[PDB]
Design an enzyme around this catalytic site. Structure first.
Site, mmCIF file in Angstrom:
data_model
loop_
_atom_site.group_PDB
_atom_site.id
_atom_site.type_symbol
_atom_site.label_atom_id
_atom_site.label_comp_id
_atom_site.label_asym_id
_atom_site.label_seq_id
_atom_site.Cartn_x
_atom_site.Cartn_y
_atom_site.Cartn_z
ATOM 1 N N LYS A 190 0.819 -1.238 0.000
ATOM 2 C CA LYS A 190 0.000 0.000 0.000
ATOM 3 C C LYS A 190 0.849 1.282 0.000
ATOM 4 C CE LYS A 190 -4.269 1.759 2.116
ATOM 5 N NZ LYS A 190 -4.835 2.412 3.318
ATOM 6 N N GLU A 240 -7.021 12.642 14.484
ATOM 7 C CA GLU A 240 -6.075 11.603 14.906
ATOM 8 C C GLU A 240 -4.968 12.039 15.848
ATOM 9 O OE1 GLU A 240 -3.147 8.214 12.821
ATOM 10 O OE2 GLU A 240 -4.807 9.119 11.741
#
Length: 425
Positions: A190, A240
């Site tokens: 990824k 986050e």
């Protein structure tokens, strides 16, 4: 009123201080209301740098103004905290870049403020730092000047600038060519690829006004804003956390796995349920948990993971797993080096991603995908610098990213990949 407190502070500055090198904090409890007016107060000031902070939990908030020391990296900022074990509440504020920025380029922009107004819950305090290599008296004098040049807080100016041109870096063909390069490389598992949208505006953006509009709409987000001067800033609203450190206690989190939000609460609940029970999304979240645990293991005595939960944000809902650890040592330098950059902003496997990004992304991310927050001896917290933007006069550069996987089509990723806040000319 703040004006009363600032007079008491000023009086205390006018009494003596040693004509020798040192550091000192003047700490004044403030009325709680001042803690509710911190963006209003910060942005009326003409002293720089400025840093605004609002915790995603609504319980911690700060306005910091001016500087007394600045550091170009975490090591030096950390070393300075360690050399001042005496000084409780000595907090250093700022940014750790994804990639070093010309502000030599610096890995971080971290500063001991001249003035810090900090709210935790209902208690607000004002702190003025004095610092010198020669004379705390010399510095007290300059601090009196700084105080006399503070301005009255004012209600926030309306978000006014309008877009007259947009462009993208990379543009679509380069995006498409880059993604093909990653699809061929995946045969890498990824890679997350960034894109900047450069809006050109009819006048200079009011950072204040932009930050206020983002707060009204981007709930459950850390809001941060570093104004380097009256024209340059970096700001954002990230859901986050990078890490929270309390002595040897550390929390971080895997935030990964998504479904859309919807304004209807029960429609949203139904999709969160689906997300909670979706294998593919759960696995994506767990590989993030594995990476984080892998990065912590040589620096902890213990690490553990809580049950997954859903974070419901304005347009999306995420899977989140908190990760709790006990550190072997209390070193923010080491924390940062282990956790940043996260797999979430770079990809998997970790070093295979970082190198792909390093080789093929034509443009530096700068502050984007790094972190924003503060450090101190006993407590440190950084948010990952997601959903953020560089303000540069009458231009604003909006950052976003896209994770690219075996199945990914350039055109679909482009259609998916803050701008919402501004209207067109």
């Amino acid at each position: 009123q703040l004006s009363g407190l600032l007079g008491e502070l000023r009086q205390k500055l006018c009494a003596g201080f040693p004509e020798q090198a040192g550091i000192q904090q003047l700490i004044f409890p403030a009325p709680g209301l001042v803690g509710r007016q911190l963006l209003e107060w910060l942005t009326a000031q003409t002293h720089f740098p400025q840093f605004y902070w609002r915790h995603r939990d609504n319980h911690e908030e700060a306005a910091v103004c001016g500087q007394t020391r600045s550091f170009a990296d975490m090591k030096d900022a950390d070393d300075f905290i360690q050399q001042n074990p005496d000084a409780n509440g000595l907090r250093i504020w700022g940014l750790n870049a994804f990639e070093p920025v010309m502000v030599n380029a610096q890995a971080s922009f971290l500063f001991l403020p001249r003035l810090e107004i900090l709210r935790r819950g209902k208690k607000t305090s004002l702190t003025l730092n004095l610092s010198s290599e020669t004379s705390l008296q010399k510095d007290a004098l300059q601090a009196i000047t700084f105080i006399d040049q503070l301005m009255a807080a004012r209600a926030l100016p309306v978000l006014n600038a309008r877009i007259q041109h947009s462009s993208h870096t990379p543009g679509y063909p380069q995006w498409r060519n880059l993604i093909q390069q990653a699809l061929n490389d995946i045969e890498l598992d990824k890679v997350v690829l960034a894109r900047t949208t450069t809006l050109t505006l009819n006048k200079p953006l009011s950072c204040a006004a932009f930050m206020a509009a983002s707060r009204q709409v981007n709930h459950r987000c850390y809001h941060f804003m570093l104004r380097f001067d009256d024209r340059q800033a970096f700001l954002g609203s990230s859901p986050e956390r990078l890490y929270l450190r309390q002595q040897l206690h550390l929390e971080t989190e895997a935030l990964a796995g998504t479904v859309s939000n919807l304004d209807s609460d029960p429609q949203a609940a139904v999709l969160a349920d689906w997300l909670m029970h979706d294998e593919k999304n759960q696995r994506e979240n767990l590989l993030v948990v594995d990476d984080i645990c892998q990065r912590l293991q040589g620096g902890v005595t213990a690490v553990d993971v809580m049950p997954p939960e859903i974070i419901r944000l304005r347009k999306v809902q995420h899977l989140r797993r908190r990760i709790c650890a006990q550190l072997s040592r209390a070193s923010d330098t080491d924390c940062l080096q282990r956790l940043q950059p996260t797999a979430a902003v770079a990809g998997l496997p970790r070093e295979a991603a970082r190198q792909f990004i390093a080789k093929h992304e034509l443009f530096s991310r700068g502050w984007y995908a790094g972190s924003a927050g503060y450090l101190s001896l006993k407590r440190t917290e950084f948010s990952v610098a997601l959903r953020s933007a560089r303000v540069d006069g009458q231009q604003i550069h909006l950052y976003a990213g896209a994770g690219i996987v075996a199945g990914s089509d350039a055109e679909q990723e482009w259609q998916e990949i803050l701008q919402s806040l501004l209207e067109h000319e």
